[PDB]
Design a protein around this nucleic acid. Structure first.
Ligand SMILES: [Zn+2]
Ligand SMILES: [Zn+2]
Ligand SMILES: [Zn+2]
Ligand SMILES: [Zn+2]
Ligand SMILES: [Zn+2]
Ligand SMILES: [Zn+2]
Ligand SMILES: [Zn+2]
Ligand SMILES: [Zn+2]
Lengths: 81, 79, 81, 79
DNA sequence: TAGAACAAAATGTTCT
DNA sequence: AAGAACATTTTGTTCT
DNA sequence: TAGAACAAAATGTTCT
DNA sequence: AAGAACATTTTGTTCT
């Protein structure tokens, strides 16, 4: 494919285990390494697309996790082999 | 009463016709003057409070307008 | 510019401090991290271009050093600032 | 005498007409059959020895030909 | 592919 | 009340 | 930009 | 002597 699985923007490649765009890559990195005590202003199912992905970091981060992103994807796939 | 009518933060006074905080005051001026077009990612009914107000500029802006904010609120001292 | 300063092939970017192609980048990395007890079969001035860069690793590595390549270029340029 | 005439490594016998090592033997067959065109990076006079022979296929190949290597050296038992 | 560094966008505060 | 300036936070791009 | 991992090219050894 | 097969070393590319 070539859609980011988090926001549907065009994927820049496979990051942290999942096809994503560059903005979602660095978003997940920052969320995972820091705090991500984010608060949804809707019902925890906000739509995350190219334009709206800035709206709700709580839902964007939930979508990163649901897509399967994980910081150790590279080293984990090396073990699996 | 010291409570922003848009986000319930502590209000700094009457801005553009409405009791608001400083952050909502300037957010509103920017929204109108930049005339940007925001889009809600929920259901057009997001909770707008001191922290969540950052999440949905579309609903925050809508609440400003609904609360009566108007850049020429003062100039409307017409007789 | 856009010539590799080591072999004159097209540069892929600035690596280890110097504009180089990808083949020269990984060549220098391997030479620096391992042994580079290479022996020139000419007079230590072999010509290193796209086709001949495979011929003499001793001279190719000398050219990497002469161009200024160094493993810590990134962290070194951070200190300088 | 057990010394490769191309690289002075220890020779394994007469290959393609010339006393050579195994590595020079197969290098020569590959050069001729792949018919590749090598280029020297020095002065067409590189030192070819057990270790340096890897550096200049052009001079190594030239030395093979000059030493008399020929893939049909055996078949040249013509009367 | 992962990540540093730079850049930009978006928001908030101070001060007049 | 209103706004400019600065500051911070949040997000996105380049890596010549 | 740095680097892991994969891939290819180039060389050398064994075995018949 | 000659060569195929395998093995190793050296070099280069992709990273869906
Ligand atoms: Zn994305
Ligand atoms: Zn949400
Ligand atoms: Zn407010
Ligand atoms: Zn909303
Ligand atoms: Zn190069
Ligand atoms: Zn040389
Ligand atoms: Zn030899
Ligand atoms: Zn030569």
């Amino acid at each position: 494919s070539h859609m980011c699985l988090v926001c549907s923007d065009e994927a820049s490649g496979c990051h942290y285990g999942v096809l994503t765009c560059g903005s979602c890559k660095v978003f997940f990195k920052r969320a995972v390494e820091g705090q991500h005590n984010y608060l949804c202003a809707g019902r925890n199912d906000c739509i995350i697309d190219k334009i709206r992905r800035k709206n709700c970091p709580a839902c964007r981060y939930r979508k990163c996790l649901q897509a399967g992103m994980n910081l150790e994807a590279r080293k984990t796939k090396k073990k699996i082999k």
